[PDB]
Design a protein around this ligand. Structure first.
Ligand SMILES: *Cc1c(COP(=O)(O)O)cnc(C)c1O
Ligand SMILES: *Cc1c(COP(=O)(O)O)cnc(C)c1O
Lengths: 400, 399
């Protein structure tokens, strides 16, 4: 059977040696060779109809491209590959849902429930469309365990509620709310749910059929893939109901100076020349990833994060914001400037970050202006944990 | 600096396999500098640690931070804050229509759009017109198949707000009198959306000299990455624009009561940037800066002329080419375009046919589609000879 082997997973990443102790995968992931090579091939070959010596390679690229939607569908257990739409990333995916589905449907007084744990990508677009339509954004607060309070959700739902915006997984706490329950509550009230899966797609890829998710968005660069590429999954009937997004070539069928008609989804929502390199590279990432049991890989990442948290908790002034033994470890050290720690740790070959992580409301809930964040991926090791802990010890001694 | 076609050509690794590649107008082959810079970006951490590749990491960072400035230099833009990153020319235009025009259009307002416009610079205007009660007014072609800039005064009215005009058509290669169109537009207090998807490649617009309001082009046309484009806008117009997409980066402060944004260009750039695209475009531009574009373009144009002159000697030949452009759109009486494209491919020649996202233009020309051979500075005289011979072989088997 498939048994996850950390060492062989590591060997697939050319950037690793230089990266040192890389603990910022939650911001962006390192790429496996398959993605590098697929991208190199794409930019080193004509996309035209002639190939005088590299026809096999060109054919492979075309196959990766034509199979890209299906590989996303397989990741999400989507019913078919026409429910997959390409975008610049999670951010565009959500804006598209807000503008193409919600905006033409929202009326003055309608309500949009958004969790206080939402990354800005899944908050700002809703504030925008609320302003545009007279709808109101309603806050879904955290419970005592720092998760969006799904128990409280039924009380917050009213006859005016139309949309629920909820992150499958937080990029700060790594916390995953009761998504199945939340969706059941939302659907009880005839609402549609926008699920931000920028983190979740990497660690617990959502079964969109089982969870009956209406819309799901994630980004390639986080999923071991290219920048400038993302996904919007939508139920077929919802994609059909959506207005066109950007106007231009590809998405259109017929055009005159009187008006235009469009293709059906997904093409309706994809104007202009696609990010072909991005699609091919994401396809390569997914195909590569398919050889690994994501469940075992994630448990490995989570186990390292736990070793780290347990050890760091023995140091003075430690505070963890981590939920549910997540691969993501957001933390703080009292009486220490975050920028100083990040810098000291970088000098020790440890790559992580601090800051607001595009989640101001969440941080405000936690009583902080920022946090340090070490995030673990399946190419990390126990020696990485030791290195982090050791560097922190030195940092604490040096920053007095 | 003297341009050498052979030196230019030797920088494109795809050529050996590509055969005779004559579809650069659709998308351009990439020089080694773009391939390598992309390879490096994806082969190295973007983190703050570099144990063994510090030098390369620094170069990548340099390319990234210098990217806006290199675009500015190409367009002679006043400063690099006038450069906004997009996914392509298409998004660039949609952004202008949605972020500048939409909030300012009252019902009855008029948007003048040339009949030569690529869909990218037409559909967004049909959209915003429907959204605002504004109306799209056609600017037709003159006798030379160019947008009739001289007719603009009869078309401009007190309701005229926007002019959408392409610097260069992707079918005829024709370039209308942009300076004159702009003077008229500005006399009526209008703003001009210049579609430079082709123009940026062949005759990059001096946006200051031409007093252009908005200018859009795509990286993939300009020997660069896919999924990256540019919107240039006068700093006043960018400041006046509403935000585009909402999310990270573009915001300053965010709460459940509302949000504030950065100023331009970041105001208009939500979420994680296509860093690979930006770095790759930077690399393309930096590499391109070493070559005299005028000499490179002169070469491409000369090849197109040798091709047109030859093909013109064949029976039933028809050309839609304007101004001795490096783009050669043509047709042969009595041939299915798809059939000729297929046979030319079989003979080692890569071109295309179809509507080229310009249905209104083709309707005006009286055709349903055309063949198009587009020449780039990495093409050669032998490419022309090969194209001609392959057309001869094709015409035998068809006509
Ligand atoms: C990264 C992230 C996003 C945004 O992804 P982009 O690629 O920047 O659009 C949104 N939500 C969460 C939770 C994220 O982690
Ligand atoms: C190619 C082209 C476009 C579209 O560019 P995308 O990268 O597809 O957005 C728009 N206008 C003209 C004239 C073009 O040639």
């Amino acid at each position: 059977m498939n048994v996850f082997n950390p060492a062989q997973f590591r060997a697939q990443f050319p950037a690793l040696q230089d990266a040192g102790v890389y603990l910022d995968s939650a911001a962006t992931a390192l790429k496996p060779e398959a993605v590098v090579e697929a991208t190199q091939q794409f930019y080193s070959l004509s996309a035209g109809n002639v190939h005088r010596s590299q026809f096999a390679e060109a054919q492979r690229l075309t196959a990766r491209y034509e199979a890209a939607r299906e590989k996303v569908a397989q990741l999400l257990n989507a019913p078919d590959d026409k429910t997959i739409v390409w975008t610049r990333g999670t951010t565009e995916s959500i804006n598209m849902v807000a503008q193409c589905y919600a905006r033409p449907r929202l009326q003055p007084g309608d309500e949009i429930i958004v969790s206080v744990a939402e990354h800005h990508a899944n908050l700002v677009p809703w504030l925008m469309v609320a302003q545009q339509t007279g709808a109101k954004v309603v806050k879904l607060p955290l419970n005592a365990q720092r998760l969006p309070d799904v128990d409280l959700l039924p009380e917050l739902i009213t006859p005016r509620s139309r949309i629920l915006a909820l992150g499958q997984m937080s990029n700060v706490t790594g916390g995953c709310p009761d998504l199945a329950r939340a969706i059941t509550f939302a659907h009880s009230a005839g609402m549609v749910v926008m699920v931000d899966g920028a983190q979740g797609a990497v660690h617990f890829p959502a079964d969109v059929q089982q969870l009956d998710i209406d819309f799901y968005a994630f980004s390639g660069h986080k999923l071991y893939g290219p920048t400038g590429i993302g996904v919007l999954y939508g139920k077929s009937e919802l994609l059909e109901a959506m207005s066109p997004w950007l106007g231009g070539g590809k998405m259109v069928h017929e055009v005159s100076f009187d008006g235009f008609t469009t293709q059906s989804a997904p093409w309706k929502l994809e104007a202009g020349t696609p990010n072909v390199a991005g699609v091919i590279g994401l396809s390569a990432a997914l195909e590569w990833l398919a050889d690994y049991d994501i469940n075992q890989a994630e448990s490995w990442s989570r186990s390292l994060a736990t070793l780290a948290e347990d050890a760091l908790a023995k140091r003075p002034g430690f505070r963890s914001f981590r939920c549910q033994d997540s691969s993501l470890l957001a933390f703080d050290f009292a009486g220490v400037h975050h920028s100083d720690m990040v810098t000291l740790l970088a000098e020790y070959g440890i790559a992580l970050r601090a800051g607001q992580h595009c989640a101001q409301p969440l941080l405000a809930e936690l009583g902080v202006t920022g946090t340090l964040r070490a995030s673990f991926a399946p190419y990390n090791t126990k020696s990485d944990v030791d290195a982090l802990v050791n560097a922190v010890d030195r940092a604490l001694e040096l920053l007095v």
